[model samples]
Target: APQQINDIVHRTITPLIEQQKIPGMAVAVIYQGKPYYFTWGYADIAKKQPVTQQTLFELGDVSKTFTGVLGGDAIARGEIKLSDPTTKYWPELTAKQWNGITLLHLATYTAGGLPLQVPDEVKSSSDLLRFYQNWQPAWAPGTQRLYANSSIGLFGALAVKPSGLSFEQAMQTRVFQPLKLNHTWINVPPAEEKNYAWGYREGKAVHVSPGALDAEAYGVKSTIEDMARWVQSNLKPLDINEKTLQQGIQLAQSRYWQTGDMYQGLGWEMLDWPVNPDSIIALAARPVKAITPPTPAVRASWVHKTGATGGFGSYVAFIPEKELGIVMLANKNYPNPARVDAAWQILNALQ
Candidate 1:
């Protein structure tokens, strides 16, 4: 590890999060398969607690990337195809105007869609489908881009159906077990309840967004300790079965559509670096489901996703060429959760 880079990140981020009064955070960076850790603030700030390596924070949209892994595995297992219609599994959407949207389209957010916050008029998933059915797309597929949770979350849910197992069961059997990630979960478990972190609002208010449309899209709870392992998996010629890995990478790397500065990957959004377009950064947000606006002069090389839910904000990224990965989990939302600029600043100083 470069001492100077570490110093710069340590100097900038620790103070910045403190200034924002972010409750607590857990960070993990893996360089060439080696791991580095950092923690600041509190998991439960009201109690004046400090964030720890083991702190369990929600994965948010970061879970999509993981879900994408299962999507890949499903394809490898001959469960489904990228070109398959989303309605194939959740057939209820077919009766509506949704037959036109394919799984790939949803994965890339290229269905040319609109915001899907459950309208008061709709109640269940069927109702949600009814609302969008027959609705014209905002943009042509693979053309314009509007980051919509409804598009992506449903993709994650449908993407894993082919595994012949429940979504939770398939993911656990395929990705989690092979990677040996103990502290990660797509759904909350009873035993880990004690380790859950409390979320905050406006630095003082206490609130959390829970079990909703975005839950599948952004509601995953995890830890930086486990995130580090997930990032490393992307760096190499996947050690898992080749066919499965290829399917996963296709979903991970697919640029089915372009939306302004970002290209839609299977479960993520890719970005061009701020200053250097030649160098790329692949980042994804969990829990906090929004794109991080790149700094003025610099463009992001690549971005996976960013998600925020309840009081958790998560950032996960990997520099494939550099073999670098970062995971930043916060107990509160105050803008950037992964703080990539800070992470990049650290990367630059090191190089």
Candidate 2:
């Protein structure tokens, strides 16, 4: 009965490429522990190349998924604790203003009033340190949830602060190797540059720009093959190697706070399984003032994330209850709703 999986995929993705003018896309799906992959269009249009399983697409904000896992890895290794105050590790944040803010507050995006982006002037980590030194909290650290890179990025940096390796290096040793995700990268090297897909915005080529916390926040790039491996690690029933890594992934997926219609995980966003695409971002943009108690991560929910660079856009969603998941990566910066719309259709049909 599931033999028409290709048909379902084609019916959903074919038109998306035509309408959005996406030059390249790689899609991967998992249902009941079985895997399916489909790629289309061109990774480099003028050079005459078609997309393949090896093509790397910028993960954008979805990189936060890995950053979250990195934090969990630190916790699993007894290197850090959620309740540890930030000022303890960071010499730059010694000001009394940092009081009451803990690693958990940053992991959940509830660190007072951090902005959605780092200030343009804050170029390096030291620059960002000064910014944090001078910045004031809009409210108590855990009282409100404002989804922002400023907090989460620092969370990643602090998680690996003691290791003396760059965030990218720590992820490779602690997370990627353990999970067997060999193809992922926060900074693609020259040898693999050819596989990197050229991101297109309308007619011009575009890619993500460098900034403070860029790698920790939204700087990863990977192929569909690696992304599929990532989603597999997130599903608890399946063992994806090293027990600590898997445990960390589960910890990262734990529901931490409730904001609007959705629940926030360390990295993933949790919503009920039957939710629609429109409801995904209904309250994600604006600042949320009301606070709710921490939730036990046992409830049935569909966990998902969306990432976008200047040129590429990506979406990943999975329902643990149904054992269903989908990953959509494209070389064009399309709307998040469109990515959700296409993935929802594909995931629904596979079941």
Candidate 3:
């Protein structure tokens, strides 16, 4: 049975590695609760360290999924509320200026058009407060959709505030430990440093240059072994010990916002089933602008996220109805569509 899935994955990804020139990849699948793993290429081309289940890949925006769960858990524990005005938490933001902005707005990237990133010079929390104090919204909240690090970053930091733990500690204690995600980290520690994959771009091995809120926004590194478990938890209600963690998964995947053909879950993106090739490309490859929708379109069939840094790319997509999931992590940054296409073909065949 695993051989069948193995054949399917290899058939789909072989040409991808050749064409994309990806040095390493780790792919994991869960079908009807059975797991299969396939690793290829080298984590380090010079040392010839082959990709393995433990090789850590930067999750980039996929890290937001963890942030989503963190916020969800906070909500589950009654520490946060989606409808709470953001100014309620940050006294620095005057209610007159940020009146309608709520946690739901921040979670869904609809907080009145924050940019894709925090301004480079807004280095400290006090500086950030000043920046937010000075910002003037072009429109009301819930009007536009701008995929951003600033909004989610603020939401994440505030979500952890009540726990009296730093953002990273809150994640480790509240989310990762409960979910049993031992190999995921906001910072790869020295003891685990050897397993961290050296991401490749052209010929250079480069990693992210940390910016403010990068940890909460786009700074998680993980292994296939851990991500496969993450995917499974996302797919179904399982035997998690903590009621708080289990409920968090549900809230993270719950439909919180919708615009046109796109539906926003707390962390993941959802589309109607067997995602249209063109739609997938547009949503994943191109930039999305503010658009008023014609009703919430259709039921969501795919729950997925695409993440990348300068030198690495990762994708996680699953069908909850079918209880199937895939985790594709690669060392070289490749196009999102190519990753989608490969996984699409494999999943279709496996089904």
Candidate 4:
């Protein structure tokens, strides 16, 4: 039977459009390699346009998924090792004694005290090198938790240099092509321009927002149809080799880092929320310091990621134990879409 999770999705999600002023959205779910899709609102409200499966939207920080793919390919090709020093490729690393920082340290946001955004003086490659060339740590690596994007950006940017190509080209050749993802890209060529979605900001005068260029850290334009390939690949029996499979699983399964209850694996994050939380923050940001206490004979494992840009917001997640995966892309920057709650509803309904 085709899994119908929409009823649950409707009930659990406080529709962003009605509740949070979201203008547009796209959603898809994968179960045992098949898909059920949904979308709503306008991609270009200014032109009175409706969103379609082929419409493309920015992936924001979820570009890290592509970064993860690049890292996996690098591991498979033997061009670099995950444990290599970050300074090995771009030697100007400093700040909190960066000499000890490893590529794995950067990839997992365990690079001591690196900030989420570097200073304007550290804008470019040369800029960062000059600053971090003798950096010192605010805290020992892997000892504390603070979510940092620059740490991962350095890792993603360096992945291309050792490969002898631009970051966009290397990712397309090494990861996208092999996985058969057609509508994924850092730079959408002129011909594909028509497929782009006009992202919006909510307010009295709803208006379009310009696209951002930090593809190495945040930029990826994709359609629902193409992303289904990624979902299925994650679920399939990809027997390329035992070691590759083992490492990929390790990357996904390693719950080594955390901010509150949100534990980040190699590239994905785990959703562990308390049953009844405090009223300090929004319902979504309710801090969870540890896993939900377990009950007799019941266990849960969930993986999730959230992405945002001024123009777009998205979330993707999967529950391996339940064999379900879900994705939601929106053209408006409405922040968190209760992504975990939405994905949970779908999984529960299917079962």
Instruction: Quote each prediction's TM-score.
Output: 0.82, 0.93, 0.92, 0.82
Q: In candidate 4, what residue range of length 10 has the lowest lDDT sum?
A: 275-284
- Superposed by TM-score, candidate 1 places the C-alpha of residue 103 at a distance from the truth, in angstroms, of 0.8
Residues 209-304 of candidate 4: C-alpha lDDT, one tens digit per residue: 332226656778899877766666654425334455334434544555556545656566665422211210211222223223211111144666
Per-residue lDDT for 226-261 in model 3, tens only? 999999888875567788888887788776566666
lDDT of 1 by residue, 1-351 (tens): 456546765786787687767768777777766878888877776666667877788776677777666776676677787678777878766544465668776765656664544455665766667766646665555444455667776676787766567677777877777777788787668898666778876655343454434444665677777788777776553554556754565446555454445555656556664433223322222121223321221123445466666566777766666666677777776566336566566655544
For model 4 the TM-score comes to 0.82
> For each candidate, what is the lDDT?
0.64, 0.83, 0.83, 0.64
Comparing 2 and 4 by lDDT, which wins? 2
Q: What lDDT is obtained when candidate 4 is compared to the true structure?
A: 0.64
Query: Can you tell me which runs of candidate 4 are displaced by over 4 Å?
Result: 1-3, 10-14, 94-96, 119-123, 134-136, 202-213, 237-253, 258-262, 271-300
Model 2 misplaced stretches (Cα beyond 4 Å): 281-296
